[PDB]
Structures are given as structure tokens and as C-alpha cells.
Amino acid sequence: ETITVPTPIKQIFSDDAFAETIKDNLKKKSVTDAVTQNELNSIDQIIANNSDIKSVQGIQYLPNLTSLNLSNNQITDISPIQYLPNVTKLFLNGNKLTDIKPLANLKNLGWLFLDENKVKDLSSLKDLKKLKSLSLEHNGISDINGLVHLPQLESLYLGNNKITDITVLSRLTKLDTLSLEDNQISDIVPLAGLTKLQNLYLSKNHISDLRALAGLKNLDVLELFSQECLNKPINHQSNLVVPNTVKNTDGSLVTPEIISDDGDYEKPNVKWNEVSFIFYQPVTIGKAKARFHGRVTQPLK
């Protein structure tokens, strides 16, 4: 798309706030000032954080735009971005996005930041062969199966979601930085062969078994605290015996730190409507030191 006659900024960029962004970027005096396509072609970078932007309609007239920061606005639709082929950096944190199908077209996208939106389907990212860094925290996401075809990603932040199944991650063999903190993950076996991983954030999941991590020799940063592990319910009895299922990287059992209701440990079992125990174990994997810590809860029926 091109404009062929000088046109007031507000007629092209229909959201007042975005119109103000373009006016400021071109150093104009008013959103009623006329712009030409030549002036719009001069826009290589937009910095428009914190601007109450509700729509980026009109942005399709910025062919040379390579970096676009729309953090912390109120945007609901990013379709006008889809035909901007030179965009390589896209900051969309803190908006109201649900659909990211229009990003499928951004073949040169390199960095994409989408935290604090409501994007729940990621299959739209499969086209993106130059995507190196993706952040999708706090989106309410459960299904990450669309991340199959970004096998060249280097950094992926998926913390603070509703993820249980990380099967697809075994294909993301270029990852050096991965966050899955504050999800619902118990099975970390899909990580076991991802030997390039350097930085791995796994706190606040449901992880009780570290065997999956035993071969990750390039780890430098590792976080493993505040797990919450929920056993399947068992019948209440006067004398309760529950196998300890908490395991170190070498498969040895982690001795409980504290056991509820004055219970005690007789290895491999913890003995006493619910009981629980807490564990805390410093671990080292490669150069990475972490504290493996959490609680196992046993409901009783």
C-alpha cells in the first residue's frame, strides 16, 4: 500500500493515539498535518510504548519499518502489520491480543515479545524461520504444539502459563535459553536431549523427578524451586504409608526436609483429609547450581 497525494496523518492512522505517535515520529505539529509516502518511507523504527494505542491501522504504509515497539497499549488486532515484510523486532507486551495469525507473514521476524496478552494458539508462528527470540509469558497458554516448526529458536520464555505437555520442545535443538516457570509441568523428559541449553527456568511447576536433566552439561543458570506435586488421592487410614517419589538427577531419592502432621521418613516411605511434605536439595548440573525444592501433597478420601 502507498498513499499517492499528501494526506493528513489522522485520515491514514485512524486511532488518535497512533496518529499522535506518527506525528511525533515525523516531528510534525498536529495529527492534521499532511504527510506524503516519501515521509512515511523514512520511518525505520517506531517507539510507541505506554501510549494508549487502540489500533495500528495505517501502519501498512510504513514499508521500511524494521523495529516496532507497541508495549503496554490496548491493541486488539495486529492485522495491519501483516504486510510489513522488513519488520525484524516486534514488542507487543501488554496489549489485548488474541489472534496472531497476521504474524505468519513476517518472514524476517527475529524477536517477538508477546507477554501479557491472551494468545492461546501458536501454530501461526510455524512459518518463521529467522525467529530467534520469542516471549509468550502470561497468555493463559496450554497448547504449545505449534512451536514445532521453529526449530531454529534460541530463546523461548513461556513462564506463567497453563502448560502441562512440553513434548514439542524436544525438537527445539537450538534453544540456549528456556523458561517454563510457573506452569503445571511434571514431565520434563522432552528436555533431556536439549544439550545446548544454558539457561533453564523451571520453578513453580509440578516437578518431582530430575532425571531428565542429567545430561544437560552446558547449563549455567538453573532454577528449580517451589514445585507443587499432587499425588492421586488415597484412603484415609490411622497408619499411612506413602512412597517418596522425589528424585535427584542421578535417580536417588531426596530425603524430605519437613513432613506434616508429625509424620516421619523410613526410607523409601513417609509414614504418619490431606498430608504433605517439603523437600529442599541443592543440586549442581554442569556449572549451574540450583535449589530443588517443593511440596508433595497427599489427598485422603
Side-chain angles (χ1 to χ4, degrees):
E1 276 317 286
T2 65
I3 76 171
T4 60
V5 294
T7 303
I9 290 166
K10 62 156 185 160
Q11 188 198 307
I12 296 158
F13 302 93
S14 48
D15 179 32
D16 286 348
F18 196 42
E20 187 198 329
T21 294
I22 295 300
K23 173 211 74 163
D24 279 337
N25 179 291
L26 297 173
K27 298 172 181 176
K28 295 288 193 184
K29 287 173 177 169
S30 172
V31 297
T32 60
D33 295 340
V35 286
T36 62
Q37 188 55 58
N38 194 65
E39 283 170 312
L40 300 179
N41 289 346
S42 81
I43 303 174
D44 306 336
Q45 180 182 19
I46 289 180
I47 304 177
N49 57 297
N50 298 96
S51 301
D52 296 351
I53 290 161
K54 295 156 197 56
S55 166
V56 292
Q57 175 53 218
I59 207 173
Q60 67 276 15
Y61 294 105
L62 282 40
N64 291 319
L65 185 61
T66 73
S67 177
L68 178 55
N69 184 350
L70 297 163
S71 296
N72 289 96
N73 286 290
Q74 327 186 14
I75 297 156
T76 57
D77 174 30
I78 52 162
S79 73
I81 293 173
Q82 73 187 315
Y83 301 141
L84 291 201
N86 293 320
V87 182
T88 69
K89 289 174 190 181
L90 193 43
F91 308 84
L92 289 169
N93 291 314
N95 278 287
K96 302 185 144 177
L97 298 169
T98 50
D99 175 14
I100 60 167
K101 288 181 174 199
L103 307 178
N105 302 68
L106 302 172
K107 283 191 188 174
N108 294 313
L109 197 64
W111 293 352
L112 177 59
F113 304 100
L114 282 166
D115 289 8
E116 300 281 10
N117 283 279
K118 290 189 169 194
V119 180
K120 287 171 184 31
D121 180 358
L122 308 182
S123 50
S124 288
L125 299 175
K126 69 174 197 199
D127 278 339
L128 307 175
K129 292 179 184 156
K130 293 167 56 173
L131 191 60
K132 289 179 197 214
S133 176
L134 178 56
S135 191
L136 283 151
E137 307 214 338
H138 298 271
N139 274 269
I141 288 165
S142 51
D143 181 357
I144 59 158
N145 291 331
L147 298 179
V148 65
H149 273 109
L150 296 170
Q152 84 299 328
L153 258 192
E154 296 166 10
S155 170
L156 175 60
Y157 287 76
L158 282 169
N160 281 101
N161 279 301
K162 298 179 184 174
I163 295 162
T164 62
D165 180 2
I166 57 166
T167 292
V168 60
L169 298 184
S170 61
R171 295 149 160 286
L172 304 188
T173 59
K174 298 303 168 65
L175 282 179
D176 67 46
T177 298
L178 172 59
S179 179
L180 290 161
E181 72 183 22
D182 203 2
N183 278 285
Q184 295 164 222
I185 295 163
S186 56
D187 179 9
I188 46 170
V189 170
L191 307 180
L194 298 181
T195 64
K196 287 190 195 104
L197 282 174
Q198 195 192 51
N199 314 290
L200 178 58
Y201 301 96
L202 292 174
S203 65
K204 296 193 177 178
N205 277 289
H206 299 175
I207 294 165
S208 60
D209 185 351
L210 299 179
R211 289 177 286 154
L213 307 190
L216 300 184
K217 67 185 176 165
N218 294 317
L219 286 180
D220 196 56
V221 155
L222 176 63
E223 296 188 350
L224 290 172
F225 58 87
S226 290
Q227 311 298 325
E228 292 284 353
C229 309
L230 176 61
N231 288 349
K232 292 181 178 171
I234 306 212
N235 288 332
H236 173 289
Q237 320 191 351
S238 314
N239 154 37
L240 209 71
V241 186
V242 181
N244 175 18
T245 50
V246 182
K247 294 168 191 172
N248 222 318
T249 57
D250 69 3
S252 63
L253 287 172
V254 175
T255 297
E257 191 194 52
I258 310 162
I259 303 156
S260 70
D261 302 274
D262 298 324
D264 69 33
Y265 186 48
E266 185 188 352
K267 185 182 187 200
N269 295 322
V270 177
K271 303 191 176 184
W272 293 263
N273 80 1
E274 150 196 332
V275 302
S276 57
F277 55 100
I278 292 161
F279 62 91
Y280 176 84
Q281 177 66 70
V283 298
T284 293
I285 312 180
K287 289 188 176 183
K289 293 189 179 156
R291 297 160 178 192
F292 180 43
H293 156 270
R295 177 162 56 241
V296 173
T297 300
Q298 182 60 69
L300 300 185
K301 48 176 162 78

